């Protein structure tokens, strides 16, 4: 039923892109159904984080959602043209205003736990922004990048997703499946 939840409650472009990423990783969205939901949720937050934000050129470049080949193509181009340090792992966005990459985490555990996992892996100039399903966020140097309204929008979406999962008795399983 999580499969059904995902196809019923995410935009179909998001679900198609989540399927695509799983196939590239070698994982079956028909089996790893909680991960499927997590990938959809994370992609949606990436798209929400970028949407409506301009400098009209887009303020953010979206890296998540692209396959690895295209994602490195875009990262390489940005590093070449801006001189910013090249990350050793693919991040989620680039912020043309602050000239830094951003790694987005969406977590169903303590926000600090997920923050430390990302940071332990990043080893540095990539900015980290973690959101939870409880309304909490944590970001590097307490710098949340976006305005308060745009963050509230993401938080509301996460609030809504949690509430609907719980109505279908999908939340408890989903929540306990997260591991780093
Ligand atoms: C890099 C990677 C991410 N994912 C998932 C974990 C997260 O739910 C989602 C977003 O990843 P991220 O926070 O590392 O950008 O994609 C995989 O399933 N396999 C992978 O190799
Ligand atoms: Mn990513
Ligand atoms: Mn991420």
Numbering used by the authors: 0 to 54, 72 to 139, 141 to 197
Sentences from the paper on this structure:
Influenza virus replicates in the nucleus of infected cells where the heterotrimeric viral RNA-dependent RNA polymerase, with subunits PA, PB1 and PB2, is responsible for replication and transcription of the single-stranded viral RNA genome (vRNA). For influenza, cap-snatching involves the binding of host cell pre-mRNAs via their 5′ cap structure to the PB2 subunit of the polymerase followed by cleavage at nucleotides 10–13 by an endonuclease activity which resides in the PA subunit of the polymerase. The endonuclease domain is at the N-terminus of the PA subunit and has a core fold similar to other two-metal dependent nucleases of the PD…D/E…K superfamily. Here we describe high resolution X-ray co-crystal structures of the 2009 pandemic H1N1 (pH1N1) PA endonuclease domain with a series of specific inhibitors, including four diketo compounds and a green tea catechin, all of which chelate the two critical manganese ions in the active site of the enzyme.
